[PDB]
Structure 1
């Protein structure tokens, strides 16, 4: 069989069913299954997504070795994913030297210096956010954060990636908003894990998990802008300026544009929802932050790149949220060679997995781990936190390239919104929040809260 491998290496795990492997155990979802396995088996364990062996690892030295020490050499790519179509060229899907080349060609886009240049742009839609929120707070109707934050995240994306400027909550039907707004335990991807041999089938059928129509709209919408700016501060331009030299192709450039939307749309919006839920169910933290924000920005002063880094309690709130809700859930690299790391034989072809969610909630590193307690990130206690236990942006050469941009994007939305409003539970607010038993880190029920004007 293929299912004998962990039994042979003396590695414990749950016993796999033929063909299926352990996937029925995802019925309660990745994270609950990860927690269970941690408790039941210890520091290392194995399971099978279908015939695919996955070794979980939770020792910080070993995690360091995989994520940083042996990245370029051994643990370079994520778990194969498909069908992708032309998206094979997206950085996050790309493999080995094409990844190394893409990552280089795109790293200077995400510098502090280029980020500081984008703060004015990400600020103006904080204002747009307020005015849409006020229209909902002067009419004391409970608000669904995912639509209004979704509208906001969506606003920052189009602006920061193509210079297109819209109020997606208000022009929700402009052509540029439709395509762009468009789960690994849904019927489709569970089937991909049992029948991964079916991927090269869909590839030759140009069936793509990225719908073939959105990809066509932006391939052409990009080339319109490309040739309307060429010739006559955003991500697209920064990429156009890069291929003005091994340099970035034209279809390669459309693909990265798409990964950036997918990356910062549901994530920026989802995280902000998780932070407003905790702010509302912990109103002292909410007050403590409103004070810190008014002290650095008095009279509702507009935030700047520099003032944002000045805020310590703000950063603590963000970091403690991502501890409870690390939206990647897991990190993963494919072992490309027989290797021994930190005293353990890892055979070629195993997927190596770091169960972030489960370690963020591990009582052996965290006190009262399910309690929302920002103080664990105080300049006092922030030093007692293992950066290979807390990894909401991954770690090493393949960590989240957009990390600085995402923290800034979120913090700008939070500052402007707590400058103006307070957030209180409704009776229809789900307390305590229940995580989706599905395949995405998101709430069972969408977070609804009451909004009031300061």
Structure 2
């Protein structure tokens, strides 16, 4: 045919807005999928987007045609601050340069290595201490968990951890959580469509912008302090590395290594390295209270493989298939980034006898892969067995795509995996969880779904084992 994928008919400017619910974007698009197939075109206001549903559609595009689908599309709320600068929301040579440098700098600062392992273990101990200080009292885990995750990437980017009592530290975390939650609301989803008007209008979007601006002002501040203390022979952190790279590139008029990219790349890492893991942890713990028998089984393995005295280390995962299945199932159930992060085609693309013009936006529906009925027996349930064979051994899935796949996939994946393993395991080793509520009545359905999947507010207690 050589045509754009089929889809419902758009109206000028508003696009397919009347055919969609902004409170439930994922459900809206999946419903439209039922009629037009797993590869269809939608109009998010003025934005023309090809939607890829289910495993085969997403993998075929994003891996089998990796280079063709490896452009970055928009996220309107985040583009408000980044403006195409920094590593995440950027394109071509910019994205290429920053991605290469960031991957390399994270390694030099210990990621994938012993150095960051020791850093995560130290921070996990500070979490345990904090959770003991609650004295088994009913509490909101939110910022306890976010504090601990954040201090890991903070270590890499700013040179050291924040004090848990730093009021500015909690301030930044509130900005992150707030901006994130916004993008998952119906207004955040409306904004994805009508940002041309809405960025200039009053509303909840303006407050979202203010939190993002806060985060920007704080990085800009940390950079200035690093510049006026810089030893160009001994970098303390990501910032100093980037500042040093900037010096070496000072006579290259076409460099990507300028101040704005430094500020934005550093914001990307601080944000990405905090909020997704945090959210996964919070959702994980509530999932576990809803399924206390899963927790029982987690406990059996921890006590057997690790025992009571030593701290979990990363290699313990090799001997711990049940824990590996549990964390996999949390990432699968939680589905933190349900519609991925928008890609776009780099040049004129043929895909499944559709034609996709250059610059075409693409929604890889990661949530529809994580729930694909061809890969999971009961996609709607929480069930570690999804990731286990008959002998109780860990079973990988091609449908396991929470970090996405292809050329612009998550490069924090390894860090994220190390953190989820060590934080989950050290908490579970030290505490049993208690809900303020009866396991029968715990609501594990999402509070919001949009750009992210946000779980419902809850309190709990950590009782010593």
Same fold by TM (over 0.5)? yes
- Report the counterpart of residue 350 of structure 1 in structure 2: 360
Q: CA deviation at 1:27?
A: 3.7
How far residue 155 of structure 1 moved from its aligned partner, in angstroms, is 2.9
Q: 1:392, CA displacement in angstroms?
A: 0.5
Paired with 1:148 and 1:391, the residues of 2 have a C-alpha distance of: 27
Deviations 1:253-310 (A, max 9, x none): 2221111121122211110011111211112221222222233322331222333455
1:131-168 residue CA offsets vs partner (Å, 9 max, x unmatched): 221122x2x43222212212222333323321333332
Q: CA deviation at 1:95?
A: 0.6
- C-alpha deviations, 1:13-47, integer Å up to 9, x for none? 34445532233523441222233234444322222
From 142, 158, 165, the equivalent of 1:162 is 158
Give the match's secondary structure for 1:89: coil
Distance 1:230 1:414 in 2: 38
Post-superposition offset of 1:423: 1.0
Q: From the superposition, tell whether residues 299 and 74 of structure 1 become closer, same or farther in structure 2 (CA, over 3 Å).
A: closer
Partner of residue 48, structure 1: 43
Taking the aligned partners of 2:408 and 2:34, their CA distance within structure 1 comes to 28
**Distance in 2 between residues matched to 1:333 and 1:53, nearest whole Å:** 12
Residue correspondences, number = 437
Q: Which residue of 1 aligns with 2:178?
A: none
Residues 107 and 401, structure 1, Cα contact 8 Å, conserved in 2 = yes
Distance 1:373 1:428, change over 3 A: closer
The change in CA–CA distance for 1:80 and 1:28 in structure 2 (over 3 A counts) is closer
Among residues 452, 457, 460, which one is paired with 1:441 in the alignment?
Answer: 452
User: Residue 205 of structure 2 aligns with which residue?
Assistant: none
- Helix, strand or coil at the partner of 2:126: helix
- Shift, 1:87, TM fit: 5.4
Query: How many Å apart are 1:320 and its aligned residue?
Result: 1.0
Using structure 2 for the length normalisation, give the TM-score. 0.82
C-alpha distance 239-416 of structure 1, shift in aligned 2 (>3 A): farther
Task: Return the alpha-carbon distance in structure 1 between the equivalents of residues 73 and 50 of structure 2.
Answer: 14
**1:263 is matched with which residue: 269, 272, 297?**
272
Contact 1:19/1:51 (CA < 8 Å) preserved in 2? yes
1:108 aligns with 2:104: yes
Distance 1:434 1:320 in 2: 15
RMSD over aligned Cα, in angstroms? 3.4
Partner residue, 2:219: 218
How far did residue 439 of structure 1 move?
2.7
What's 1:194 paired with? Answer: 194
Q: How does 1:309-320 map to 2 (within 5 A)?
A: 309-320=318-329
- Offset at 1:192? 5.2
Residues 438 and 304 (structure 1), Cα distance of their counterparts in 2 relative to 1, 3 Å cut: closer
TM-score by length of 1: 0.84
Distance verdict in 2 for CA 1:309–1:354, change over 3 Å? same
Match for residue 126 of structure 2 among 125, 128, 132 = 128
Distance 1:33 1:176, change over 3 A: same
Q: Name structure 1 gaps, 5 residues minimum.
A: 1-5, 202-206
